[PDB]
């Protein structure tokens, strides 16, 4: 698959921005050694203090019971 998508979430001083990209890659299992510069998408001014977050997936079976990377930051 020649499709790599990367997203960046930040939450500072009441401003919310999202940095996104689509790019083609060709490697068997994980990220290649190539380099490129990400671009911002949209600025959101609500600025809610976010502590816990969840993602979404696509699936068919409605079994309701009541590959993504995540890293930390240093200033």
């Amino acid at each position: 698959f020649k499709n790599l998508r990367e997203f960046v979430f930040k939450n500072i001083d009441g401003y919310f921005k999202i940095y996104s990209k689509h790019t083609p890659i060709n490697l068997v299992r994980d990220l290649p050694q190539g380099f490129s510069a990400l671009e911002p998408l949209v600025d959101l001014p609500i600025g809610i203090n976010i502590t816990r977050f969840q993602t979404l997936l696509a699936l068919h079976r409605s079994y309701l019971t009541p590959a993504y990377y995540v890293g930390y930051l240093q200033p």
Binding site: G14, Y15, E39, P40, P45, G47
Partner: protein
């Protein structure tokens, strides 16, 4: 209206003058003030 610790979202400007070009005058570009000769540039900028 409220003045709590939050970014300002709603306010409206008013039309004052018309566009000017190629003469060194002061300008207010998105809150940035400066004075210079405006000359068309051939450099390609990033969309953001």
């Amino acid at each position: 209206f409220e003045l709590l610790h939050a970014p300002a979202t709603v306010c409206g400007p008013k039309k004052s003058t018309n566009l000017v070009k190629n003469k060194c005058v002061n300008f207010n570009f998105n809150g940035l003030t400066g004075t210079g000769v405006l000359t068309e540039s051939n450099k390609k900028f990033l969309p953001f």
